[PDB]
Amino acid sequence: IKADHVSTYAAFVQTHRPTGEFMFEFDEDEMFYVDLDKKETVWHLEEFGQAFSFEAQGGLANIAILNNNLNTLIQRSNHTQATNDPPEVTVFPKEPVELGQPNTLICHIDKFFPPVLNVTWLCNGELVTEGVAESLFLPRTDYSFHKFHYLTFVPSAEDFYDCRVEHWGLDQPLLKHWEA
Amino acid sequence: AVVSQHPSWVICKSGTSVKIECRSLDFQATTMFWYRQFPKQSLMLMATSNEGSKATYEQGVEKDKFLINHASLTLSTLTVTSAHPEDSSFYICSARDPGGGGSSYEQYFGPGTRLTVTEDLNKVFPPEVAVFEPSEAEISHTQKATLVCLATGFFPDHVELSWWVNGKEVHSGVCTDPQPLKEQPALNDSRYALSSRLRVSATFWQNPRNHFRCQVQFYGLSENDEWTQDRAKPVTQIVSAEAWGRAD
Amino acid sequence: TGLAWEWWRTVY
Amino acid sequence: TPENYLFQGRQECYAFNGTQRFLERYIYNREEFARFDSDVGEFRAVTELGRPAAEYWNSQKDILEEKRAVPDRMCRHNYELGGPMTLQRRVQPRVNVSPSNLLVCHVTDFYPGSIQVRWFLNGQEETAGVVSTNLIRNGDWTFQILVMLEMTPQQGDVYTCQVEHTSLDSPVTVEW
Amino acid sequence: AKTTQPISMDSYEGQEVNITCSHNNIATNDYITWYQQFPSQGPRFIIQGYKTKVTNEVASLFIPADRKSSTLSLPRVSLSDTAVYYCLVGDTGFQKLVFGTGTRLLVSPNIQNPDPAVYQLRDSKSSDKSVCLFTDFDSQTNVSQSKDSDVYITDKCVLDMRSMDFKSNSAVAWSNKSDFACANA
Ligand SMILES: *[C@@H]1O[C@H](CO)[C@@H](O[C@@H]2O[C@H](CO)[C@@H](O)[C@H](O)[C@H]2NC(C)=O)[C@H](O)[C@H]1NC(C)=O
Ligand SMILES: *[C@@H]1O[C@H](CO)[C@@H](O)[C@H](O)[C@H]1NC(C)=O
Numbered sequence A: 001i002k003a004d005h006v007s008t009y010a011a012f013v014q015t016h017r018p019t020g021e022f023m024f025e026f027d028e029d030e031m032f033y034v035d036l037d038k039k040e041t042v043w044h045l046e047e048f049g050q051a052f053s054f055e056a057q058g059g060l061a062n063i064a065i066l067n068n069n070l071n072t073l074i075q076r077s078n079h080t081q082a083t084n085d086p087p088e089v090t091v092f093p094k095e096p097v098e099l100g101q102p103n104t105l106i107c108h109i110d111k112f113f114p115p116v117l118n119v120t121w122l123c124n125g126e127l128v129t130e131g132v133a134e135s136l137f138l139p140r141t142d143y144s145f146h147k148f149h150y151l152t153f154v155p156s157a158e159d160f161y162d163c164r165v166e167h168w169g170l171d172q173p174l175l176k177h178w179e180a
Numbered sequence B: 001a002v003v004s005q006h007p008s009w010v011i012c013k014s015g016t017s018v019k020i021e022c023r024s025l026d027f028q029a030t031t032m033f034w035y036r037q038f039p040k041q042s043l044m045l046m047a048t049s050n051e052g053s054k055a056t057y058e059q060g061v062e063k064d065k066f067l068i069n070h071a072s073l074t075l076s077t078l079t080v081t082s083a084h085p086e087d088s089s090f091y092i093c094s095a096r097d098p099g100g101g102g103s104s105y106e107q108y109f110g111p112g113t114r115l116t117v118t119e120d121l122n123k124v125f126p127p128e129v130a131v132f133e134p135s136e137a138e139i140s141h142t143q144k145a146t147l148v149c150l151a152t153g154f155f156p157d158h159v160e161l162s163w164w165v166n167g168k169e170v171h172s173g174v175c176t177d178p179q180p181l182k183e184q185p186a187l188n189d190s191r192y193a194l195s196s197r198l199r200v201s202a203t204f205w206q207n208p209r210n211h212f213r214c215q216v217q218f219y220g221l222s223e224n225d226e227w228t229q230d231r232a233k234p235v236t237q238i239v240s241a242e243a244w245g246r247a248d
Numbered sequence C: 001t002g003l004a005w006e007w008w009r010t011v012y
Numbered sequence D: 001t002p003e004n005y006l007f008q009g010r011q012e013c014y015a016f017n018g019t020q021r022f023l024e025r026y027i028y029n030r031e032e033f034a035r036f037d038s039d040v041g042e043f044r045a046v047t048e049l050g051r052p053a054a055e056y057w058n059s060q061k062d063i064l065e066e067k068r069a070v071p072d073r074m075c076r077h078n079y080e081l082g083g084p085m086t087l088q089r090r091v092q093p094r095v096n097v098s099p100s101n102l103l104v105c106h107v108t109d110f111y112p113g114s115i116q117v118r119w120f121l122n123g124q125e126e127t128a129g130v131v132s133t134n135l136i137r138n139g140d141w142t143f144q145i146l147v148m149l150e151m152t153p154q155q156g157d158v159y160t161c162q163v164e165h166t167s168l169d170s171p172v173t174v175e176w
Numbered sequence E: 001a002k003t004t005q006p007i008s009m010d011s012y013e014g015q016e017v018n019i020t021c022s023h024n025n026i027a028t029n030d031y032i033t034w035y036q037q038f039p040s041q042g043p044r045f046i047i048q049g050y051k052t053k054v055t056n057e058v059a060s061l062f063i064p065a066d067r068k069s070s071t072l073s074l075p076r077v078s079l080s081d082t083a084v085y086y087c088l089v090g091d092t093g094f095q096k097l098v099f100g101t102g103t104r105l106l107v108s109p110n111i112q113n114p115d116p117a118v119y120q121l122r123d124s125k126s127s128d129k130s131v132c133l134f135t136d137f138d139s140q141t142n143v144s145q146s147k148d149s150d151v152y153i154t155d156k157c158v159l160d161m162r163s164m165d166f167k168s169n170s171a172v173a174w175s176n177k178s179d180f181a182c183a184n185a
Helices: A046-051 A056-076 B138-144 D048-057 D062-080 D084-085
Strands: A006-014 A020-026 A028-036 A041-042 A087-092 A103-112 A116-125 A132-134 A145-153 A161-166 A176-180 B001-007 B009-013 B019-025 B031-037 B045-052 B066-069 B074-080 B090-095 B107-109 B113-118 B131-133 B146-155 B160-165 B175-176 B192-201 B211-218 B236-246 D006-016 D019-028 D030-036 D043-044 D104-110 D115-121 D124-126 D130-132 D142-150 D161-166 D172-175 E010-011 E014-020 E031-037 E045-048 E060-062 E069-076 E086-091 E102-109 E119-122 E130-137 E158-162 E168-173
Touching: A006 A056, A006 D062, A020 A056, A028 A056, A041 A046, A041 A056, A056 D006, A056 D019, A056 D048, A087 A161, A087 A176, A087 E086, A103 A116, A103 A161, A116 A145, A116 D006, A132 B236, A145 A161, B001 B090, B009 B019, B019 B031, B019 B090, B019 E102, B031 B066, B045 B066, B045 B074, B074 B090, B107 E031, B113 B211, B113 D172, B131 B211, B131 B236, B138 B146, B138 E119, B146 B160, B146 B211, B146 E119, B146 E130, B146 E168, B175 E158, B192 B211, B192 E158, D019 D048, D019 D062, D030 D048, D030 E045, D043 D048, D062 D084, D104 D115, D104 D161, D115 D142, D142 D161, E010 E014, E014 E102, E045 E060, E069 E086
Parallel strands: B009 B113, E010 E102
Antiparallel strands: A006 A020, A006 D006, A020 A028, A028 A041, A087 A103, A103 A145, A116 A161, A132 A145, A161 A176, B001 B019, B019 B074, B031 B045, B031 B090, B066 B074, B090 B107, B090 B113, B131 B146, B131 E119, B146 B192, B160 B211, B175 B192, B211 B236, D006 D019, D019 D030, D030 D043, D104 D142, D115 D124, D115 D161, D130 D142, D161 D172, E014 E069, E031 E045, E031 E086, E060 E069, E086 E102, E119 E130, E130 E168, E158 E168
């Protein structure tokens, strides 16, 4: 399909957590989503919230519609569970690497299914609970998913980082390394 | 998509709590609206309940007066906390089914709820039914015979009138008053009276073997009600008056 | 300001 | 592998030359079975799993009239409304050249995504040995690209990385 | 949005009735939906539309190009069509699609042989209890309002004998007080 700009509503409901998401992307960039727990509309950039507005019930009700379609398609398909697709992990910084300059490390998990992940940041082989931030489970054209994980870090000399990814398609957690 | 609303008729004293159940039988809804219509006025949206969230009360209603609970995707209930004679109205609920049904915007309304709060259940009285035979002056003039029914002395105004000819209900040549008039106006709790007319051909009334009956279904008290008066307890009852044909 | 969305249909 | 099942759907608006095309997909576990296309006009089955669902949707004629009005009621509405902050959103890129024998021109923090990154050696554009990466999405409405250039370093040479972008009046250049 | 409709309409049976709804400040985001509410029950959806003209069993919906108005064209009206017709505009959400003061359509019958008369009816129990009946009067005949608190007069009502294809307006009047005769203005 030929297009100059693509605006897509994406939503999914599953058995495990997260049991549901409702987002809207503009040119493959998540603009906003509906927090199914707080029942509010969360905008990506604050610029959008000042110029737009979305009814949170439009996402809440559509999630309920997909929940019915989930139970219906579970019976019609005779409880067929899809195969676990292996994720692809690549780590890269947001800005040019520089000592003392607070940068942001990006871990891009891609081409996986189902949307169930346990992603965690590791610095020098130790956990990093500070400066962690993640995106939603973003959709793809082949109906698989991709996700972003961020870590605000200050580059030092001998510091190396890792992106530990746990998925049902991996027999052991995957460690994607980055040092330069 | 069918929506049920129970109870359909309710009579209670001031201060009594009244719970109304609005169920969606063949669909699950996240939002179910609650309306209210007065005997001569138009519809008024009271509040909008949401599943697992707060109810969007419209302007004019008090959340401490009309408690609303969206317990499930199927059930949404409205509760009149403190009964007052001013609360007497016609409460309806609606529910949208965006996933199923001919329209995404179609609000499926329930059967409705007729409510009447009184300061004393001693005001509740059953209707007195009577059937008046047609006039032979009309029969010899227009070759038609019109029977009229008169149910008088009912206060809750929760009645359903029907005509029966030889034991079966008729839906032709029947017309009932749309608004029952008061027997004594300028009174707070006046007794009502409703009139219906059944016009048949002259040949039908002039058969002595023809039976005409006027049935008035009165919806009143229940078993779990307090009745401490000398006269009979005006419970939900069916009162009928009859009249056989005349060949003169 | 108000954006528009669409209702997914019920599968049955 | 614990027990888990998934249902998902799409509502895609394709805008091009003043036109709006709407597609509504119904997917069960990465398998699209039902689909509405505005260019088609009615619901269609993509798999045998979605045939009973498509026939029931084509019977409710008011819903077929709703889905046909989507390209004008939803796609055209949201397109003309979000114009300022999405259709015309500009973030100027930042260029950086590091030796890392390679030479990495790391362009960062540009939103429109369409960008040209050329190499120059003493004022002459170099093409051989140029290895550019794909458009990298940061996920925060900003893009990123890395164009590595291998070189035969000679003292006195000046390597310049030229970057042209829609958000820039004149091309930005950084030299090494 | 908030709509503006005529408060009420008059018509004769068999006439095509057109109810025009004015909704000037409509959007690319809104849809047009119409409802029908019969007495003693709740409203019921009948027709909807966006841009194009819609026709079903109940009615037709005309929407001009500017979409600032919409006309509900009910077909050959019957007395069973005497109901309130609501006009609602709004989006797919649940944010206050207010039900304004609808159009109370009244379908009055056409009686070209009015025989206005007053007859007396007597109960099958007590002959002293009698009632007066004013029937076979014109549709444009305004029934009398009671000038006495001891005399009751019901509002007029129309009945349809679907076998004889005969319709007649009728009114009932009685008085519990003794020594009363069927005398009316
Ligand atoms: C993510 O982590 C959670 C918790 O560490 C995992 O949930 C556990 O799953 C195992 C099955 O392999 C169960 O035996 C445990 O009881 C679960 N934990 C709890 C607290 O109940 C989950 O499986 C992990 N997900 C992935 C994709 O690795
Ligand atoms: C855009 O649409 C118009 C009208 O259909 C057509 O004449 C024109 O060629 C189209 N332009 C392009 C680039 O397709």
